[PDB]
């Protein structure tokens, strides 16, 4: 991302929202507006594409946002546009307007240090409203997250040091999200989420193995039935743990507590945890989401929004309501549990969460 002016009288356009007076606007048009001597318009809908699983349509992800930032800064830095207001626009559907609005908000949060109430004021009570974001599963939608949720989640993640666009590697991000290179994303400095490898090694499996070996993965957690031989991870010195539960279900809290204990053990030793389910989205979202809430105090909606900003489609169907209804439990564990000092066979000799009582006995 090239350097640009660090973010004049107002201009007034229909179907346009003012973000920065005289300089940054958000439009929605079903035609191509012509540039004037006072205005320059641009859209990324012809170049930046959300790849839907089913009926999910957004939000746009961190790689989309990074590419938007490059395109935006090139327009802002053009001497031709020195005394023009820049109008970022989308087509007029409520879904594409939601994507463009949320992506401009995430830009201002991550690149220009705006705060949530600053980026949300321009969008509040817009008529027609933006389409709320739905999950990626195949059932009828019954849980929505909003731009407010995504903005707060992305902002909180940035504040906690989980997002850093200065070190973000777009080419690595884009490569490894491909099915043929392993379908994974580095979610945070501590966590990778990935689709299960498959072994009848194929190219996606070797990509995962080499990336994991070179990027300090010290624990692989398997949440779905066996599609590969775990010996290949052990061959490169990475511990492998099963915490399997049924596709499309929510984990018993005992599973979540064991996962959080396992992850804490690995993090305190300075390693990453790579978690997979079949798709690396649903069951994986339940467990990593719980740990993020436990660690950083996200709301459930923020957590879902942040997770999908890095890896679209995480937390599927009823798992959304499950995360929502248990977010207090995950947060409460910081005060009601401790990392045990006895290893546990249930998590491969790592240290599980135990109550304050059993900790006093130890």
């Amino acid at each position: 991302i090239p350097t640009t002016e660090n973010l004049r009288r107002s201009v007034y356009l229909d179907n346009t929202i003012e973000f920065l007076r005289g300089r940054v606007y958000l439009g929605a048009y079903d035609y191509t507006p012509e540039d004037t001597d006072e205005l320059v318009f641009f859209t990324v809908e012809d170049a930046i594409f959300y790849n839907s699983f089913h009926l999910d349509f957004g939000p746009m992800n961190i790689g989309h946002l990074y590419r938007f930032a490059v395109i935006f800064h090139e327009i802002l830095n053009d001497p031709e546009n020195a005394n023009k207001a820049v109008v970022f626009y989308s087509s007029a559907s409520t879904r594409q307007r939601a994507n463009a609005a949320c992506m401009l908000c995430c830009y201002m949060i991550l690149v220009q240090a705006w705060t949530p109430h600053q980026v949300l004021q321009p969008l509040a009570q817009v008529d027609p409203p933006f389409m709320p974001f739905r999950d990626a599963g195949y059932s009828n939608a019954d849980f929505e997250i909003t731009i407010q949720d995504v903005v707060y989640g992305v902002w909180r993640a940035k504040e906690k040091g989980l997002i850093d666009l200065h070190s973000f590697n777009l080419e690595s991000y884009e490569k490894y999200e491909h099915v043929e290179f392993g379908d994974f994303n580095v979610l945070t400095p501590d966590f990778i989420a990935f689709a299960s490898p498959q072994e009848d090694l194929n190219q996606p499996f070797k990509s995962v193995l080499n990336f994991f070996a070179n990027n300090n993965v010290q624990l692989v957690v398997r949440l779905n039935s066996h599609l590969y031989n775990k010996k290949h991870f052990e061959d490169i010195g990475i511990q492998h743990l099963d915490l399997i539960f049924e596709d499309g279900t929510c984990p018993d809290l005992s599973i979540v507590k064991n996962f959080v204990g396992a992850a804490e053990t690995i993090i305190k030793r300075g390693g990453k945890i790579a978690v997979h389910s079949k798709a690396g989205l649903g069951r994986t979202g339940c467990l990593i989401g719980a740990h993020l809430i436990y660690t950083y105090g996200f709301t459930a909606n923020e957590c879902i929004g942040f997770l999908r900003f890095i890896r679209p489609g995480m937390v599927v169907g009823p798992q959304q309501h499950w995360l929502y209804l248990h977010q207090n439990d995950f947060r409460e564990w910081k005060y009601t549990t401790r990392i045990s000092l006895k290893p546990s066979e249930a998590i491969g000799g790592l240290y599980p969460l135990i109550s304050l009582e059993e900790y006093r006995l130890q």
Binding site: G137, Y138, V179, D247, G248, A279, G282, G313
Partner: peptide, 8 residues
């Protein structure tokens, strides 16, 4: 159709 969706 209740499971995780397929990337493709």
């Amino acid at each position: 159709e209740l499971g995780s969706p397929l990337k493709k």
